[PDB]
């Protein structure tokens, strides 16, 4: 019954080719609801003109702060203005079934590497290296964590509860997976069993193969959960099995939308 709201921000310089690419994507659970892009859900559309003017203004100002960060970062690492660099951050809050704050988040990455993160107490920072320690010092003096904390415990939790209510029909409802097992012989003795899960939401799901009731955790090829293209997700797990002893193998599907975890097994007509 718990939910989350998270923003995924990007700032990537493009020296000699144009201005930096700035992006901000907001999600509630696994649903994207807003996207700001310098290069550019229904329940968010109902937000008045002030909501959009204000958020757009925040994004614009945020990109200016990012321009400042990018150039300070270049100085810390003594980099030239010639190479492209990327500044990223993820922030948001997690609330329990009662709509109450469980934990806040705010971390930054420079060129794909963890840089500095606001600790769970939303009062202290964890810097990744000496450069991030310069940032940490600057932010402790400016009491940045207090400002971020105010947002995470207040604004963040408040609007997530609002979005959860405004879009309840799609948000607090999970889509069960459509499953099927496939068989494809690798040879006479060994074959292949692949367990499929399609059209489910949220993305969270567990697929495990077991034989004689024991998880074949080590002989299971599990792929990364992928988007179907229609808000739902897909995923499969494969395992090799000897011809004939296939009924000895079962696929166990765990998912929020399922009334009870499935114990599937392959088949022909």
């Amino acid at each position: 019954g718990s939910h989350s709201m998270r923003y995924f921000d990007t700032a990537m310089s493009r020296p000699g080719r144009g201005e930096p690419r700035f992006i901000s994507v907001g999600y509630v659970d696994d649903t994207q609801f807003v996207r700001f892009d310098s290069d550019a859900a229904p329940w968010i559309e109902q937000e008045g003109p002030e909501y959009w003017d204000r958020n757009t203004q925040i994004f614009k100002t945020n990109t200016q702060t990012d321009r400042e960060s990018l150039r300070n970062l270049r100085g810390y690492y003594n980099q030239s203005e010639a190479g492209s660099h990327t500044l990223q951050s993820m922030y948001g809050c997690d609330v329990g079934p009662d709509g109450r704050l469980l934990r806040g988040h705010n971390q930054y990455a420079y060129d794909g590497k963890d840089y500095i993160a606001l600790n769970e107490d939303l009062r202290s920072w964890t810097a990744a290296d000496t450069a991030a320690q310069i940032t940490q010092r600057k932010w402790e003096a400016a009491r940045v964590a207090e400002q971020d904390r105010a947002y995470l415990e207040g604004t963040c939790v408040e609007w997530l509860r609002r979005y959860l209510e405004n879009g309840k029909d799609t948000l607090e409802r999970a889509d069960p997976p459509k499953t099927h097992v496939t068989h494809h012989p690798i040879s006479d003795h060994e074959a292949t069993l692949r367990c499929w899960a399609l059209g489910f939401y949220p993305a969270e799901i567990t697929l495990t193969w077991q034989r004689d009731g024991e998880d074949q955790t080590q002989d299971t090829e599990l792929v990364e959960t992928r988007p179907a293209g229609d808000r739902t997700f897909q995923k499969w797990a494969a395992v090799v099995v000897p011809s004939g002893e296939e009924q000895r193998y079962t696929c166990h599907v765990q998912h929020e939308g399922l009334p009870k975890p499935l114990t599937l097994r392959w088949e022909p007509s």
């Binding site: 923003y7 907001g26 958020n55 994004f59 100002t61 702060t65």
Partner: peptide, 9 residues
């Protein structure tokens, strides 16, 4: 709702 960040790294 977006958070405004005023301090750069």
């Amino acid at each position: 709702f977006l958070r405004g960040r005023a301090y750069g790294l």
